[PDB]
Structures are given as structure tokens and as C-alpha cells.
Amino acid sequence: AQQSPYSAAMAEQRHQEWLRFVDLLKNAYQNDLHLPLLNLFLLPDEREALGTRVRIVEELLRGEMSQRELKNELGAGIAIITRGSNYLKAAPVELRQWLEEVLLK
């Protein structure tokens, strides 16, 4: 096994719990309950962070905004730009290509 039984048992529980949330939200979208579901489960600052992270990813893909514009307009300093860029690189290419189609056109 990759992990010792204690760590593996914790990870399996967290994994099932994550998928339960993912499925709940999937069905909420189908029922047009997604907005109140997300308001329940995400704090206001967490919702704002998600909105801002979308802009950071958009601007990283677009390539036009400078480092200082990213910091002054979106709060993204050097470390945030580096982390977000790393997360983008780690994503499947299929997702990156879809994000380019949605977010940039």
C-alpha cells in the first residue's frame, strides 16, 4: 500500500466525504439550488477567493496583465502567481484547453 493503515483510513474517509459534497452540488445545480447551497457551505470570503482565483487563472492564460497589475488589481503577489501557475500546469491539458475556450472566448 502507498500509505500506512491509519493514514489510509483517514484518506479514504476524506475522499468519500469530498465525493459526497461533489454529488450534492451536482444535484443542486440540476434542481437550481446551487446558489443557496454554495452560500450555506462557503463563507463570504471563501466565495470571494473563488471569484478572484478565476480572474487570476484567466489573466495567467491571457498573458497580457503584468506582475504588478496582478498584485494591485487581484491581490496576487509573486507567491500567489507562482502557486496558481503551478496548479494550472498540473491540471489535465483537456481542462486547460477548455478553460481557454470558456474564459477567453
Ligand X SMILES: N#CCc1c[nH]c2ccccc12
Contact set with ligand X (CB under 6 A): 40-41, 43, 53, 56-57, 80, 83-84, 87
Q: Is 66 helix (H, G, I), strand (E, B) or coil?
A: coil
Report the C-alpha gap between 56 and 31 in whole angstroms: 30
For the CB of residue 57, give the shortest distance to ligand X in the complex, in Å. 5
- In the list a copy of itself, ligand X, none, the entry touching 80 (Cβ below 5 to 8 angstroms by class) is ligand X
User: Contact 84/57 with Cβ under 8 angstroms?
Assistant: yes
Q: Single out the residue of 7, 8, 9, 29 in contact with a copy of itself (rule: CB under 8 A).
A: 29
